[PDB]
Amino acid sequence: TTKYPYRVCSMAQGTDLIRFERNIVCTSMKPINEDLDEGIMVVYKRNIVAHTFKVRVYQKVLTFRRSYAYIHTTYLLGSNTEYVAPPMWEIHHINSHSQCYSSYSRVIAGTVFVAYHRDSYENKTMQLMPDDYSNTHSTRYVTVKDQWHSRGSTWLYRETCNLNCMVTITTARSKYPYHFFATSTGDVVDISPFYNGTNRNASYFGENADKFFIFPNYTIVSDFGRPNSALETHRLVAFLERADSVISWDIQDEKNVTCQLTFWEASERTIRSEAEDSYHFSSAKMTATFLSKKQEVNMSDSALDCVRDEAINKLQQIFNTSYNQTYEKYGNVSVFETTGGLVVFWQGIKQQLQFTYDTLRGYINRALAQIAEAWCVDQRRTLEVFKELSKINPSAILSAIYNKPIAARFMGDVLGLASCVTINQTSVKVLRDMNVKESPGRCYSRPVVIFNFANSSYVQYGQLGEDNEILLGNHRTEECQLPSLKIFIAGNSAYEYVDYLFKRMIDLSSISTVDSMIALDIDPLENTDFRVLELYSQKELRSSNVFDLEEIMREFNSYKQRVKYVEDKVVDPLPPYLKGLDDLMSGLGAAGKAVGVAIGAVGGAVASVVEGVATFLKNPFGAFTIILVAIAVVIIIY
Amino acid sequence: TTKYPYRVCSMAQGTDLIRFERNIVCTSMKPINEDLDEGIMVVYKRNIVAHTFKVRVYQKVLTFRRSYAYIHTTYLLGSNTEYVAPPMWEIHHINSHSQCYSSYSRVIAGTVFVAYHRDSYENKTMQLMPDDYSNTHSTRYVTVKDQWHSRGSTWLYRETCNLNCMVTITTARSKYPYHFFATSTGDVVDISPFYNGTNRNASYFGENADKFFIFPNYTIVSDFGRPNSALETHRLVAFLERADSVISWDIQDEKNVTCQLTFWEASERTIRSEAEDSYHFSSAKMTATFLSKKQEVNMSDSALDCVRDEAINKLQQIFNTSYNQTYEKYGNVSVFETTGGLVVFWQGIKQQLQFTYDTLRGYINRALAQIAEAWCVDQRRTLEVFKELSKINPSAILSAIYNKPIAARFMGDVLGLASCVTINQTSVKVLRDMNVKESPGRCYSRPVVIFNFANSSYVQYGQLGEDNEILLGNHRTEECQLPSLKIFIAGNSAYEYVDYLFKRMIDLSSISTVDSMIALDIDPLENTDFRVLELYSQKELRSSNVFDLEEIMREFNSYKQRVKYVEDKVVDPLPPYLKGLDDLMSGLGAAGKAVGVAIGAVGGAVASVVEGVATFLKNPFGAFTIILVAIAVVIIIY
Amino acid sequence: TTKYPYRVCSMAQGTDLIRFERNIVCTSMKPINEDLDEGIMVVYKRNIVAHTFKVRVYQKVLTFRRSYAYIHTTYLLGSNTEYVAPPMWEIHHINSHSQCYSSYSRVIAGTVFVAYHRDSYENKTMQLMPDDYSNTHSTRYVTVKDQWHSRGSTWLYRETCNLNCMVTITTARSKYPYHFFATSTGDVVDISPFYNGTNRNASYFGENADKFFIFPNYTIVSDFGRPNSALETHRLVAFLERADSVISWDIQDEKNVTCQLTFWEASERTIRSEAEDSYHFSSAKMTATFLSKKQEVNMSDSALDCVRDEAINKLQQIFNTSYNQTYEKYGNVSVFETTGGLVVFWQGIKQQLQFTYDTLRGYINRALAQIAEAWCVDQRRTLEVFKELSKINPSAILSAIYNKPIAARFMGDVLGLASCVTINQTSVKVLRDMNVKESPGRCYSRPVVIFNFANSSYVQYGQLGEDNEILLGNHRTEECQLPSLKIFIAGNSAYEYVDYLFKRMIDLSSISTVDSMIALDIDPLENTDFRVLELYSQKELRSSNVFDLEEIMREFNSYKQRVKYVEDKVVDPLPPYLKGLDDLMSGLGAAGKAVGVAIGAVGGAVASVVEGVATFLKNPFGAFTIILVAIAVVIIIY
Ligand SMILES: C[C@H](NC(=S)Nc1ccc(NC(=O)c2cscn2)cc1)c1cc(C(F)(F)F)cc(C(F)(F)F)c1
Ligand SMILES: C[C@H](NC(=S)Nc1ccc(NC(=O)c2cscn2)cc1)c1cc(C(F)(F)F)cc(C(F)(F)F)c1
Ligand SMILES: C[C@H](NC(=S)Nc1ccc(NC(=O)c2cscn2)cc1)c1cc(C(F)(F)F)cc(C(F)(F)F)c1
Ligand SMILES: *[C@@H]1O[C@H](CO)[C@@H](O)[C@H](O)[C@H]1NC(C)=O
Ligand SMILES: *[C@@H]1O[C@H](CO)[C@@H](O)[C@H](O)[C@H]1NC(C)=O
Ligand SMILES: [Ca+2]
């Protein structure tokens, strides 16, 4: 199954942005000049090359966790992490020996608080070792992989720190005009990658003054994790100290320039309707409809000399492709610059009753041009439709219209693209179970999977999706209602779960496609389900009533009811008006005209005293005192 | 940015209704008559003009609010509003002096309860002043804009009223045959606007008998709010006392009639396939396919004499547009009434080897007609697709297919249309923040905006949407996970929030459209995110696990789990079976055969006594008594 | 209204499976051979007939319910059902006399527990009577329709059983190659319906060995429910004892075989572009584009002799349909097998300046073929679009593209089809109310309906949907905000609810379709709503703020906020860290350096004692003891 390998792509950061431009206008191609020409043209747009240069990021996560230890259990009373960038000497030590210290020494506005890794009060060094989230364009070298659950002595509230020095090596990508590069994780900095010390006017720079360091001949270790690797001196290295991280990169070298060509497509039949100055290339591809101004762009122009020779030959071959001797060439090659920005160039071609033949050919050409002109609108319609379908599942739409497996994610108003991460591909066991072990009456919705990220030894838990791609998480449970005939696609083979235990594998042949079933299927059987009906017709339709199986329709008819559930449910365990007071309303609810005022005043005084009494009673020491005095009185009775 | 002004259109009442008719059928245009004609026709449908006449509505909102006042805080023990229509003399006073009373005097079935504005027990008068929700088709003149939070004396439960006399001036719209008009706010009445006293048979009337008043020469003030304006006597005014409002309007005058024409479109090439009686106008616009019966509609007909002359000239000009002398006219103009109801009229045109030319022309015409016939189906398909896309975002779909900014809202099964309200356009500050100030760890999803409704001085709070339109509310928060690169479109300029603090404005050029990127993009970068992965692989995937960023797909896989959350969460703080009883089950849960019965009986008696004891204990006076007796006993020990 | 009868189709089990195959490829039809032919062909695909044979299923549901009875109310302390298949002798008794016993006698691993229907300790017999869920393809004969709410003696915890013997008669459907048949309810078994005792190699069998019984001449009662019906001896009957049911069926007889033909369609104009071996039938239907290998399939083949004669005649008639004498036949009929698997057969046809005419005809044919070739892609695009629209409402999409009323439901990755159940059609009262009677401030979203399932006398409750089809449940409530103008479609007639009380019926003519309104509507009115605005601009936008009326858009902007509501709401009434302990954190929260440790230790000891004291206090007997000793001490004071 090399066609569809396991992939966990549901996450996509920046470095790629695409949009769905709203307004595109089609023309009205019947102003003048019922007579018209035809030739052979080839089309290509303008593109720019990006740059990838493998930045590095240093960071140090420190978290406090305070807890209390009972005799048999240990309660955690909350925890809080925070990220702080390391000082410069620590970064020098990291880049020189691939080991970092275990004592952070920040100062907060009046004095220093020397934190420690394990409250051991030592200045030791810790190595770096690989982490369990690898890629082809990412790596980590965290130094404390585990978490510390030290129970400690009973009845002793104590707090601990977990300094977790880390280095990561991502790959960034910047585009023209090269004045901000976004890394793989998501960090964005407004500095040109080509900015060395003395290129302020030529290359952009807008970050800060004393947050920038350029080092020449910086001895950097080749690969972290190995205790003693081999060093290698780079030319220039740049550091960009931020408030919570440190970014570093190699000062890149000057860019190569060849030209901007794409080779969009090469057509074979075009139609030209010259109105007055707006030569229309009504191409017969039914997807190309351009416009240009009636001026040759001077083929000997100083912006396209790479394709200058390559411009001619292809046209010639396409001529010899189909126009051997019946069709004769007409003039030299011509070059037109369109309104969009793409250069398109073409070669003209041509071939009593001769007048009749010419009239027939002209009429047919006019008909075809008008048909294409009317066809122009469905492209606008399709873009409009996709602009709304992309709100349901961007990944599917983009992968369908690009013919590549692509993971995309919304970023407010513009999509962000990325490829798919690839799992080990060897150890992925699909459990033959769907029932939640702990909870009776609830079973998973999609089979649970246990994959393993590359170059690691730590298992995970995800759930199978469509086309054999893993989606993260283990929380797609659902109440479930026997019998069931779930079938999951892993093309070209489908799993068949019957009553939630893995009946058998089935080859994908006994499920007729709707496309091949446009004709009359014999007859639907009109089946029924009795558990759901018996549950509805006893009025406890709360949880198992429906699972919204036809989701996006049946789901929005119920949401306004869940909102009321949540509101009413929240109001009761939400701080009331001093629940003891809640009776007074009922006291006035029944009857009473003016006794209510005096009753309210007396109740106010009484409640003022009793609330203090109860507040004293709630502390354990006060409760013990009450118990002691009660026992003492009872003993005194004797 | 005059192209896209700020607008707050997310609300749309009636007065406009549109539908998505399901079944439209395409024909089979090859019965007979392979030979066929062609001409030039122009098409227009039938429309009717509406009527807008600026009704007025009087109302009086009165609300009770009861509260208790502690020493440092004031609790509100609920409140309730209610709307009541004012009596007739109050309306006369309002329309004569633009000031209304402050004492409502309803009777409830046995006696009168004279309410008062502030329990001041006076019969004063209050002026009317403008409200903070204006429009081009709405206004209000509320008399008490604020709310009364009078603390009052401590320890005194008291209730207050807030009589809030109001008048509003909307604009209604009614359509043929003029027998019900719906106002802007949403009120609908079944009375023809032309119904004066003596038009029962000619104009509809179906509301009631003693709920209608017609006044001649009613002295009405010109504009409320000004203490002394200039009066103006209208001809007839009508009042329609309802149970909770009073509607009034001017008795309109008799309608003008000219004709019903639309000028749908003017084509240039048509194709006619006369089968036996069903002349088919297979127009070359690829969107027009009509049918009619083989009978001229008698151009000298008494329903279209306005366009009678205008019918001919346009055809002539289009002839001179393209048919100078090669194409000769054929007969007189002809008029056909289609099956839909639209009248279409046309002028016929025409021009050894002549037979060959005729055969070629006929074959080409047949081919084009068949192509259009096959094209007829995609319109049905597109309507079917839009019928389901309209369930995702009606406003976007309707604005796309109408090329106007339109706000629409479902009304059960039929859409309701309206334009967009326009804000002051001058003072709209977009805050450069996204973090919720009070709650740490939660930050907004779209930037928060502070606009200002026209002709007011009271700020509001809304959130920015797409294409620079404000959507109401301040509640789109979300847990959020650094780093972020949010980009919001305000065409043609996009805001860029990096880590939720307003990095900088960016011109909309560095985001390549997918339409212009049909070709091969270089390569996606395969990025990753470590915070989400570390959160998943420790099994606390509850709140920050996912935000359903690719919403409508990832959202319905989780809904059945939120349902279980809500159910289990509700069950516990929901009235149990007298929680003291809950132990008995466990008492029988472990073991026991027949001791359970006796234990249950004894527990029943004990619980019967103890519940009464606890009910006595819960009142503050009983608690104070218990405290007093305990202290007295302890003192007595001494 | 026979066009749209009431139907309750929202449920669909298996027995029908369809799929949405992803990749379909269009060709490039310009390799070679600019010259090309044309003929007349007819097309039909391959289909297989299914089998329906009316299985039977026996089952016995037994449920335990334990409860306690107070003096005025009766609490139920949970209940649990379970399904168990009956033994063989009980099934023999059921099939011989249509009455079943009331005493289940299972054994659990060490001894028998004889359950009883009502703890009456008797071995009586109970009849079978019809149930209130009937169909054309389902029935039930449950023996205990009601539920037992016997109050019993006060203060006596007791449990009861409700044995509910049942038999059902569904209809299954199996398809080629007949090796698993799925019943209507949802049960699936992997046995060929034709498997009698001695067909192991010819017919599949994969269930088990000692879970199968074949009985010859089994005297089976004709119809259950009647105390004494007429018997009828079938040939062979098969039982398939499962763990919780018993399935039975008649051993079917050998299948008939005629042929596999469908008669897809009969075209009239085709275009053939023979490249080298891949004759392309570029049909002019604009939906047919095939491919085959250059070899006749030997019309005298032993797989299609049924249509062998019928193959010729239709072609002939279509010739006489349009080709009388101008068009002459060319050779004999030819038969081509396509790549898909469908056989298509065709008859060729044909008809100085002759060369010119031939060139014109060839050029036109090439143009039309290229247009169809370019058209091939929109079918792929439409399938891609429907693959995502089917995630919103499968029923609507399938019913639109099949032109039949079809209820479909997702089954993981493949759709399941069924027709619509039909209600009595006579007694369906649509209540003229929408306000929830018990709850003030909440009113239904769609009108509530009271239908009645066929052949029953037990009312139900459902809600009206679109196109006059009932959807089950009574839980689509919503907070609601006057005024309202709801209009519900029951084509061709719409209900109009104004302020939620059934204003009047309206014929469907005063709502203009968007399809007929492509032109300029006069002007939208720009209406407004004041209740919603006043609710927003006072900051209590929690429940009535919005109902997500434009659902699928406004709904996913709020979901991440409901998630936080649920999380925060759950955390508080979720088992805390022994709430008495919660103070210690605040004790260390303010200040303290080392007194916290000693305070924590003392608090630990005190809490250890006090928790035991409170646990003793929570039992009713301990509370009564405390009350007794307190009263005794107070009396002793005297
Ligand atoms: C009928 C009477 N009801 C009272 S006195 N209701 C009440 C409740 C609350 C407040 N005030 C505040 O809650 C408050 C908060 S801040 C300021 N005031 C004031 C009055 C009653 C009194 C007794 C007694 F005499 F034994 F106490 C027992 C019962 C019994 F047996 F039915 F339970 C009933
Ligand atoms: C094991 C025994 N358990 C009992 S007696 N359980 C029980 C609970 C509830 C009910 N009945 C109702 O709740 C009821 C509601 S309406 C009608 N009846 C009846 C019985 C037990 C008794 C004592 C004692 F003697 F001190 F009380 C202390 C403990 C201790 F130390 F473990 F806590 C345990
Ligand atoms: C300020 C002082 N606060 C204390 S002592 N706080 C505290 C709370 C909890 C724990 N420990 C555990 O909860 C625990 C669970 S497991 C192990 N330990 C330990 C200490 C205080 C003491 C009194 C007194 F003396 F009357 F009691 C009254 C008040 C008053 F008037 F303000 F209410 C305040
Ligand atoms: C280079 O940068 C300097 C900044 O000091 C600027 O003044 C100058 O115009 C730029 N260009 C050249 C050619 O020096
Ligand atoms: C029939 O089934 C038997 C199973 O014992 C198998 O050995 C045999 O090959 C099958 N076919 C024939 C023709 O006997
Ligand atoms: Ca199309």
Residue numbers in the entry:
A (entry chain A), B (entry chain B), C (entry chain C): 86 to 436, 483 to 769
Task: Copy out sentences from the published article reporting this entry, exactly as the authors wrote them.
Human cytomegalovirus (HCMV) causes congenital disease with long-term morbidity. HCMV glycoprotein B (gB) transitions irreversibly from a metastable prefusion to a stable postfusion conformation to fuse the viral envelope with a host cell membrane during entry. Antibodies directed against the viral fusogen, glycoprotein B (gB), can neutralize HCMV.
We stabilized prefusion gB on the virion with a fusion inhibitor and a chemical cross-linker, extracted and purified it, and then determined its structure to 3.6-Å resolution by electron cryomicroscopy. The molecular model of prefusion gB fits well in the low-resolution electron cryo-ET envelope of prefusion gB on the virion, confirming that the structure represents a prefusion conformation and that the stabilization of the prefusion gB by the fusion inhibitor and chemical cross-linker did not substantially distort its overall structure. In the model, prefusion gB forms a tripod that is approximately 100 Å in diameter and extends 110 Å above the viral membrane. The central core of the ectodomain is formed by three trimeric coiled coils centered on the threefold axis with an N- to C-terminal polarity toward the center of the virion: one membrane distal in domain III (α3, yellow), one membrane proximal in domain V (α7, red), and the TM domain, which is embedded in the viral envelope (α10, olive). The legs of the prefusion trimer are formed by the peripheral, globular domain I of each protomer, which has the fusion loops at its membrane-proximal tip (blue). In the prefusion conformation, domain V residues 639 to 669 from each protomer are sandwiched between domains I and IV of an adjacent protomer, “tacking” domain I down to the central core. Domain I is further constrained by the interaction of multiple aromatic side chains (Y153, Y155, Y160, W240, and Y242) in its two fusion loops (between β3 and β4 and between β9 and β10) with the amphipathic α8 and α9 helices of an adjacent protomer’s MPR, which forms a “scabbard,” shielding the hydrophobic tip of domain I until it is unsheathed to insert into a host cell membrane in the extended intermediate. The interactions between WAY-174865 and gB are mainly hydrophobic and aromatic, involving multiple hydrophobic residues, including Y153 and Y155 in the fusion loop; L712, L715, I730, A738, and F747 in the MPR; and P751 and F752 in the TM. HCMV strain AD169 escapes inhibition through mutation of residues homologous to strain Towne G734 and F752 (18), which are WAY-174865 binding residues on α9 of the MPR and α10 of the TM, respectively. The visualization of a fusion inhibitor bound in the interface between the fusion loops, MPRs, and proximal TM domain shows how the inhibitor stabilizes the prefusion conformation and provides high-resolution data that can guide structure-based drug design.
